[PDB]
Design an enzyme around this catalytic site. Structure first.
Site, short mmCIF file in Angstrom:
data_model
loop_
_atom_site.label_atom_id
_atom_site.label_comp_id
_atom_site.label_asym_id
_atom_site.label_seq_id
_atom_site.Cartn_x
_atom_site.Cartn_y
_atom_site.Cartn_z
N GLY A 243 0.79 -1.21 0.00
CA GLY A 243 0.00 0.00 0.00
C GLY A 243 0.83 1.27 0.00
O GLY A 243 1.89 1.33 0.62
N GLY A 244 0.33 2.28 -0.70
CA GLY A 244 1.04 3.55 -0.77
C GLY A 244 0.30 4.65 -0.02
O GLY A 244 -0.89 4.87 -0.25
N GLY A 245 1.00 5.33 0.87
CA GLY A 245 0.39 6.40 1.64
C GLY A 245 -0.84 5.93 2.39
O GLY A 245 -0.74 5.19 3.37
N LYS A 247 -3.47 4.47 0.68
CA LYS A 247 -4.17 3.57 -0.22
C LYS A 247 -3.97 2.12 0.21
O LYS A 247 -2.95 1.78 0.81
CB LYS A 247 -3.67 3.76 -1.65
CG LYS A 247 -3.98 5.12 -2.25
CD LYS A 247 -3.51 5.20 -3.69
CE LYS A 247 -3.89 6.53 -4.33
NZ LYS A 247 -3.44 6.62 -5.75
N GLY A 248 -4.96 1.28 -0.09
CA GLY A 248 -4.88 -0.12 0.27
C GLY A 248 -5.13 -0.39 1.74
O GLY A 248 -4.76 -1.44 2.25
N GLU A 366 7.49 0.65 14.23
CA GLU A 366 8.45 0.68 13.13
C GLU A 366 9.80 1.21 13.58
O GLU A 366 9.94 1.76 14.67
CB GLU A 366 7.92 1.55 11.98
CG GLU A 366 7.62 2.99 12.36
CD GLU A 366 7.07 3.80 11.19
OE1 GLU A 366 6.05 3.37 10.60
OE2 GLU A 366 7.64 4.87 10.87
N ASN A 368 12.61 3.76 12.24
CA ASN A 368 12.94 4.81 11.28
C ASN A 368 14.46 4.77 11.18
O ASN A 368 15.15 5.13 12.12
CB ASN A 368 12.48 6.17 11.80
CG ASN A 368 10.98 6.26 11.98
OD1 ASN A 368 10.49 7.08 12.76
ND2 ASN A 368 10.25 5.42 11.25
N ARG A 370 16.99 6.52 10.38
CA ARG A 370 17.61 7.82 10.16
C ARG A 370 17.63 8.65 11.44
O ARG A 370 17.01 8.28 12.44
CB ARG A 370 16.81 8.59 9.11
CG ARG A 370 15.37 8.83 9.54
CD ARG A 370 14.54 9.44 8.42
NE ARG A 370 13.14 9.62 8.80
CZ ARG A 370 12.71 10.51 9.69
NH1 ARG A 370 13.58 11.31 10.30
NH2 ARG A 370 11.42 10.60 9.98
#
Ligand SMILES: CO[C@H]1CCCC[C@@H](c2ccccc2)OC(=O)[C@@H](C)[C@@]2(O)O[C@H]([C@@H](C)[C@H](O)[C@H]2OC)[C@@H](C)/C=C/[C@H]1OC
Length: 549
Positions: A243-245, A247-248, A366, A368, A370
């Site tokens: 999924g993107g952003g 979506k999904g 999650e 990250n 960085r």
């Protein structure tokens, strides 16, 4: 000058080639910098850095490293900086360009044309003949192709951050959660709970999940997903791993709506694997600051509480965390460390957690890979110069030879004695001091409106605030040039950092600074939020600010 010596030559032989740069200490002439790296157990001398960023990130990197350079060598330009300059930044007379020892012009527009363009960054790194690249946050900082292509260059350019394999070891949501579970990190109940078998390439350390295992956490059909959802308990989230952003993804409140919503999410990202997960409610968002060297040593630098969010955007954050019981947060720290060690993490990173104060449990969200913009909160309470630590780690210097870290552990900063970061033995507890946060820091995100009206704007892209009424506060507003969505903008974002001996004191100092700032042509709502009973009593949640609106 001379230093206490650390001989890590054997360990250097075990390191992956991508960690080793061109200018290794063994084939380099004597020099203050070379002597420092060699004596401290490092392998490569990084004397020139290309900053693949702009704005506050570039300014912070330069100031932090130069300060360390001055304190250590008496010359703040011991490590040189090359800047990338877009037409937008050049035209705004961005401070970081002026600050850099040299700069190279790059195309304007959205960041895919400049600061986030991997091939360009590699090209410039070679053209500028640099030893390393620092990306910080935003742009291409989380793109594994950046450290990979940099290391593939004949110039053997080092990436001051985690290796591509570490970034890749945490792929989609499904693979990522399975890896965390294999590291014994508690995760939110989902269709993959219990799935914790991972495959580690015996030669690269790359962590992956075999298809037969990955699918164990996937839905074979809408009906299958419904069964998995019933077990987990509604409400649940249906999510397409690819999924993107936004979506999904679909939130499901009741069984009766599941099947239909399943198709809605699936249809947005066709062919994508789908997993079900319990829906997090109003809780706490805590982060653990991770720092890892190249020899498997991962440590935590306490954490930050960023529960106060608006539209999932962190507005108010504080360090250290105080809502969780001391031992419970130590468990979050230890779990973050287990995960870091497993994925072969290196440099600065953040492990995000969902924490419920009602039952005291926490869950992995999650990692990250960085350094984050709010890192000074952690720097202030730990006394660690993070960009300087990243740089030394990138040169191959082990954790115990980083001065700020030795100080944090109550050691003689000049000594080369090994440190047992896990305090496993009586000997360790005898020669070391368990790290204790120094005071408290509150950080507030602030926004301003400075419309582009043709008239020459105030020079520079980083507008700093030097408060006349507060002694423990610093802040800034930065011109947002070359973002991924906006190449330039009328809006300006920034942060204010306030220190105090304790939570109440840092909070008070923040309010004082904000009031002083409000006497300018925004921060009005922040002052109200900070003076609310809930915030003062620390009874807020991730939904608190949204509920007020
Ligand atoms: C953009 O550069 C700003 C950044 C200021 C960040 C806020 C500030 C602070 C925190 C809380 C409250 C008030 C102020 O943090 C600090 O000053 C401390 C933590 C820190 O970042 O200082 C920097 C380094 C020595 C190191 O990284 C770290 O020291 C361990 C130096 C180079 C200061 C640079 C500043 O420019 C003068």
């Amino acid at each position: 000058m001379e230093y206490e010596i650390t001989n890590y030559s054997e360990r250097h032989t075990e390191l992956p080639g991508h960690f080793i740069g061109l200018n290794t200490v063994d084939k380099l002439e004597e020099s203050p910098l070379r002597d420092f790296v060699k004596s401290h157990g490092g392998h490569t001398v990084i004397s020139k850095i290309l900053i693949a960023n702009n704005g506050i990130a570039a300014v912070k990197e330069i100031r932090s490293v130069r300060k360390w350079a001055y304190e250590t060598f008496g010359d703040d330009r011991t490590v040189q900086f090359v800047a990338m300059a877009t037409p937008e930044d050049l035209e705004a007379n961005a401070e970081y360009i002026r600050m850099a020892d040299q700069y190279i012009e790059v195309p304007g527009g959205t960041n895919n044309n400049n600061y986030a363009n991997v091939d360009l960054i590699v090209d410039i790194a070679e053209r500028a003949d640099v030893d390393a690249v620092w990306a910080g946050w935003g742009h291409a900082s989380e793109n594994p192709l950046l450290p990979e292509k940099l290391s593939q260059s004949k110039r053997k350019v080092i990436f001051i951050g985690p290796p591509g394999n570490a970034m890749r070891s945490l792929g989609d949501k499904i693979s990522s959660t399975i890896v965390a579970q294999s590291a014994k990190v508690p995760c939110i109940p989902w269709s993959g709970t219990g799935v914790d078998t991972v495959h580690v390439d015996e030669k690269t350390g790359l962590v992956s999940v075999d298809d037969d295992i990955y699918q164990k956490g996937c839905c074979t059909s809408p009906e299958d997903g419904l069964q998995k959802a019933k077990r987990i308990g509604f409400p649940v989230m249906i999510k397409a791993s690819e999924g993107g952003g936004g979506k999904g993804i679909r939130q499901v409140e009741r069984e009766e709506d599941f099947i239909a919503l399943y198709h809605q999410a699936a249809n947005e990202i066709p062919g994508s694997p789908i997993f079900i997960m319990k829906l997090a409610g109003r809780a706490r968002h805590l982060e653990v600051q991770l720092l890892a060297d190249q020899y498997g040593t991962n440590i935590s630098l306490f954490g930050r509480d960023c529960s106060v969010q608006r539209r999932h955007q962190k507005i108010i954050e504080e360090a250290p965390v105080t809502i969780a019981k001391a031992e419970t947060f130590h468990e979050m720290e230890k779990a973050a460390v287990r995960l870091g060690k497993l994925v072969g993490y290196v440099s600065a990173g953040t492990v995000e957690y969902l924490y419920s104060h009602d039952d005291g449990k926490f869950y992995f969200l999650e990692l990250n890979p960085r350094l984050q913009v709010e890192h000074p909160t952690t720097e202030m309470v730990s006394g660690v110069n993070l960009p300087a630590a990243q740089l030394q780690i990138a040169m191959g210097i082990p954790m115990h030879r980083i001065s700020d870290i030795r100080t944090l552990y109550g050691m003689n900063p000049h000594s080369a004695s090994e440190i047992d970061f896990e305090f496993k033995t009586q000997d360790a507890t005898k020669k070391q001091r368990r790290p204790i946060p120094k005071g408290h820091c509150t950080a507030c995100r602030i926004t301003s409106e400075d419309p582009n009206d043709g008239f020459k704007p105030s020079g520079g892209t980083l507008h700093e605030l030097n408060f006349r009424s507060s002694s423990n506060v610093w802040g800034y507003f930065s011109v947002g040039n070359n973002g991924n969505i906006h190449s330039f903008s009328d809006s300006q974002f920034g942060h204010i950092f306030a220190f105090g001996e304790n939570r109440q004191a840092s909070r008070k100092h923040m309010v004082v600074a904000l009031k002083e700032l409000s006497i300018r042509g925004t921060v009005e709502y922040l002052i109200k939020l900070l003076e609310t009973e809930d915030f003062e009593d620390n009874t807020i949640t991730t939904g608190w600010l949204d509920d007020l609106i």
